Design an enzyme around this catalytic site. Structure first.
Site, mmCIF file in Angstrom:
data_model
loop_
_atom_site.group_PDB
_atom_site.id
_atom_site.type_symbol
_atom_site.label_atom_id
_atom_site.label_comp_id
_atom_site.label_asym_id
_atom_site.label_seq_id
_atom_site.Cartn_x
_atom_site.Cartn_y
_atom_site.Cartn_z
ATOM 1 N N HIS A 1 44.999 37.848 37.392
ATOM 2 C CA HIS A 1 44.241 38.997 37.883
ATOM 3 C C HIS A 1 45.024 40.277 37.670
ATOM 4 C CE1 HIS A 1 40.807 37.231 40.017
ATOM 5 N NE2 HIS A 1 41.588 36.179 40.165
ATOM 6 N N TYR B 1 42.950 40.083 50.335
ATOM 7 C CA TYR B 1 42.611 38.960 49.486
ATOM 8 C C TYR B 1 43.819 38.424 48.694
ATOM 9 C CZ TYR B 1 40.357 36.058 46.003
ATOM 10 O OH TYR B 1 40.028 35.001 45.187
ATOM 11 N N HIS C 1 45.310 31.685 35.287
ATOM 12 C CA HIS C 1 44.694 32.956 34.927
ATOM 13 C C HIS C 1 45.430 34.046 35.642
ATOM 14 C CE1 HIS C 1 42.639 31.647 38.562
ATOM 15 N NE2 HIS C 1 42.220 32.880 38.782
ATOM 16 N N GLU D 1 47.518 33.097 39.078
ATOM 17 C CA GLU D 1 46.941 32.101 39.958
ATOM 18 C C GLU D 1 46.584 30.850 39.175
ATOM 19 O OE1 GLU D 1 43.693 33.979 42.048
ATOM 20 O OE2 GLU D 1 45.085 34.991 43.435
#
Ligand code: NA
Ligand code: NA
Ligand code: NA
Length: 248
Positions: A124, A205, A122, A114
């Site tokens: 996740h 999400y 970065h 992202e």
């Protein structure tokens, strides 16, 4: 309702409630003796066979998930760096799995790169499985950060002296360029690892994000995702939103 969308939805739903760790792999800007080391200063393609294979996987994930109905003007340097980081992140995960003698099939993981409004690039990572417990989170974060810092210093394309390389290694470790999700806490106080629910966090999400298609990237967008089942990897943005809809 392609088989790919149905398959991804089913794979996630079966893991809806699986507790997993949440990590973020990142970097921060560094200047050493006037030398600028930015987010995309790690563009060596290291000739280790596994890493090369992982980088090819990232490239092909990008290629298959690309929506050609629309033009994509992401910078070539940005794509390259993201592909490299995908390989390095996964190398770190796999190194730690080996330390614990964890067969890859006994782990579920999800990776999503992202671009944050403030922090920029970065990545996740959600990861867990039967060989995992919450109490091991701190150890996992520390081990991952050892490998991440080591690989970053090896991949760095800025010409560095040995003292500079060592300094960069210590910065990436001391400043925790791998983070672990914890419950909110007071600085002094204990920090408890906060597990997340794998399938639910992905569907509700991570799969809701907008695909980056420009340089500079749209804040909050995603570049690239993948998972241990190769289920979400090739899905285009529209297909990802269909997965969320069906999952619900
Ligand atoms: Na590399
Ligand atoms: Na860019
Ligand atoms: Na990925």
């Amino acid at each position: 309702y392609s088989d790919e969308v149905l398959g991804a939805t089913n794979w996630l739903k079966e893991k809806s409630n699986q507790e997993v760790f949440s990590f973020v792999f990142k970097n921060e800007n560094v200047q050493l003796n006037g030398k600028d080391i930015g987010w995309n200063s790690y563009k060596k393609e290291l000739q280790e066979d596994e890493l090369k294979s992982l980088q090819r996987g990232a490239e092909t994930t990008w290629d298959q998930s690309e929506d050609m109905e629309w033009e994509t003007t992401v910078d070539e340097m940005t794509k390259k760096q993201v592909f490299i980081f995908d390989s390095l992140v996964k190398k770190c995960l796999f190194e730690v799995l080996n330390t614990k003698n964890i067969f890859p099939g006994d782990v579920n993981w999800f990776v999503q790169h992202e671009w944050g409004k403030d922090q920029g690039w970065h990545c996740h990572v959600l990861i867990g499985g039967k060989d995992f417990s919450q109490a091991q989170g701190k150890w996992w974060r520390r081990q991952l950060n050892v490998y991440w810092s080591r690989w970053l210093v090896t991949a760095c394309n800025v010409q560095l002296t040995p003292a500079e390389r060592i300094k960069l290694r210590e910065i990436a470790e001391d400043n925790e360029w791998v983070t672990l999700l914890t419950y909110k806490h007071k600085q002094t106080k204990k920090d408890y690892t906060k597990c997340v629910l794998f399938g639910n966090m992905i569907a509700y999400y991570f799969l809701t994000k907008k695909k980056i298609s420009t340089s500079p990237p749209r804040d909050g967008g995603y570049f690239l995702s993948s998972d241990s089942g190769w289920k979400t990897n090739f899905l285009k943005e529209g297909e990802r939103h269909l997965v969320s809809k069906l999952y619900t």
